[PDB]
């Protein structure tokens, strides 16, 4: 039966049927957004939803008999396994985020269509050439975040009262979002010299980000 | 009579006469901004307007004889038809935006002057080389915008209550505009982990956006 | 006497004596900032100022005999002329910005020193290959600024009441400064669809601005 | 004993032991953040901290015998000296930042592990190409800041009262952070024309910065 199903699986119709289902389930989940639509046709939605999840498990079952170990060594394959997995956890218990993480299956439209795969892969491909810097930054963030927590988190615990918060705040300064009037100006009403901490910080972190951008304009 | 008018239309004088009306009508439309100017010379400029709109339809009518099916296959030409057409719809009824859309005819200074035409075309040509990325992002937005609406729209309907509002809010976070103490920090007062949605969101969407600019610094 | 003075003017001493005066006057101007320093050594600094102003006119006089027609055709020279002229307008009368524009003489350190000259010139030379785009943008701003004054100016005059006010607002949105919470969200409390005016505006204006940056990494 | 020690110091195991201590003292400093942790394991860590500091002074002493004058001419060596020297100053007297600047020793994970040094050096190397511009700007910032103080610091001393305050404000306007609603709009309720000072200031300073980024994407 193997070469029967391997012919079924590899069939354009099967792929196109899958891609068709995604773009239908995509449309379905945007309608699940409306409180109106849900009162009207929620049942229609929840069963069509449960149907699709079965069909996707069927497919993923078939897809593995036809690739075995080659499958679990394929990123894209792995992804699809993992996304439908989430979608499988019951409509109750644990963390309600799961019910929400389900919408991640609309990322299968990226996986099931090349060019997208191309583009995604084009994008991803740039990452390893950056991990040298990224690690540099995270070391930097970590070091300043600790200075911040023990320089400012007593009078300003919302922003710096905890390592986690200093990170968050330092990240915010880095996106340069409301970073003067929002955070540094106030800091200075108590600590005149907070500009000595954050102006160097800004320079470093912005400079680095410019280099990292130009690095992707080279390789 | 064809070659008579095909010599009128195709003439230098004709083109430079059209350009002369545009830069005149453009100056006329900025004087219609002032409530003062309108109480004195308002009548002058309303007629001057109807005059030019005639002249432009006369011209467009002429322009079509001289070109026929060639004309409805030229972008720049089509534009001028559509823009003058908008300028024809009576100063009443339906919606008033059409009265406001009339100011789009000053885009003819682009259409009817090279260099501008050149420069506009330079920019536009880059678009098809982005459409892979653009599509990617829209799918990304769509996925997150749905996830946000069902994670935050109950307590925070201003921002995430409707699919569209999540789109809007998400675009805002992307421009990195007051996303911290303007959206995220609030959200957190209720959903401590909301950083886990938005910090990732930010990496991806800024990352991508960096690439898309590096692409346009290659082609 | 000409070649005697033409030897004074071209003299390394003279050149370096000017450079010496600038950096001294510059330091003098940041001391004039302090209310304290002015209550102590104000008269010192006022005379030291009038002195230098003569020295710079004497020089610019000497400089002209030595160069004649050649001098009013040298950018860096013309500047130096005009910027000293400003410094000559009596410590009174007309506008008091003239008392303030006097600190533009410290832009002579750019003129009277190469490398600076080099770099400034390097920068400036990019401008002409941008005027095609800059033109395009101005037309765009002007078109959208008009629309906005006749679409939000009536209820929202602080931000769109006048053609000038809209230009400013539009410039603010373009720099993405508080554009959503500060501008578009409010607007939208009255005009639900203002987003249809601003999101496109923002795409266009930033796209164009991306190109112009890549343009200065082609040339 | 020189070659005995020159073989200890230069040894891989000595390096890998130093890197191992950094990564441990690193972890331990992010734990000293928790007030909880300090009330339980505080003594453990303060002792652990004083230990490593000796080990680092021992090492830095050893490192010097093995290199002599070659050592105080190596950036990376000097750094480690100065950072450990700070850490040597007793847990008392003076400013309190020295007790905080102590966390700068986690910058040794950069100095004493290749790849970072590479990347760091790749960064720094770019700086010399920038110092021509950087200077230009700093003359500019100095010039406008003086103008600003005498144009706006009487009504608006928070932001422009002092030469230093204007620096800071100008820096802020440059990062484009809340610059309209937060600074320039206000100024305008008193000085209608301040946009004439800040629109140009913004152009100039953003232009320059675009070049400077394009400069680094070529050299
Ligand atoms: Ca910003
Ligand atoms: Ca901002
Ligand atoms: Ca803000």
From TrEMBL, chains A, B, C, D:
Specify which residues bind sn-glycerol 3-phosphate 3 according to the UniProt entry for this protein: 162-164
Q: Where is the Ion transport domain?
A: 12-219
Q: Where does sn-glycerol 3-phosphate 1 bind?
A: 30, 34
GO molecular function terms attached to this record: identical protein binding; metal ion binding; voltage-gated sodium channel activity
Q: Where in the cell is it found?
A: Membrane
Cite the binding residues for Ca(2+) 2. 178
Instruction: Indicate the principal place this protein occupies in or around the cell.
Output: membrane
Q: Which domain of life is it from?
A: Bacteria
Give the residue spans that cross the bilayer: 12-31, 43-66, 78-98, 119-147, 193-218
Q: What is this protein called?
A: Ion transport protein
Species per Swiss-Prot/TrEMBL record: Aliarcobacter butzleri (strain RM4018)
């Amino acid at each position: 039966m193997y070469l029967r199903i391997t012919n079924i699986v590899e069939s354009s119709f099967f792929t196109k049927f899958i891609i068709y289902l995604i773009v239908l389930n995509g449309i379905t989940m945007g309608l699940e957004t409306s409180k109106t639509f849900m009162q009207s046709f929620g049942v229609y939605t929840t069963l069509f939803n449960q149907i699709v999840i079965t069909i996707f498990t069927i497919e993923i079952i078939l897809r593995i008999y036809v690739h075995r170990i080659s499958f679990f060594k394929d990123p894209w394959s792995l992804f699809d396994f993992f996304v439908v997995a989430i979608s499988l956890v019951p409509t109750s218990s644990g963390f309600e985020i799961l019910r929400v993480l389900r919408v991640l299956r609309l990322f299968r439209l990226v996986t099931a269509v090349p060019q997208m795969r191309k583009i995604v892969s084009a994008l991803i491909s740039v990452i390893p050439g950056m991990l040298s810097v990224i690690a540099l930054m995270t070391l930097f963030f970590y070091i300043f975040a600790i200075m911040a927590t023990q320089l400012f988190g007593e009078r300003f615990p919302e922003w710096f009262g905890t390592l986690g918060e200093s990170f968050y705040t330092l990240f915010q300064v880095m996106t340069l979002d409301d970073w003067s009037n929002g955070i540094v100006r106030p800091l200075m009403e108590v600590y005149p010299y907070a500009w000595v901490f954050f102006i160097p910080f800004i320079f470093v972190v912005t400079f680095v980000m410019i280099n990292l951008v130009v690095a992707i304009c080279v390789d």
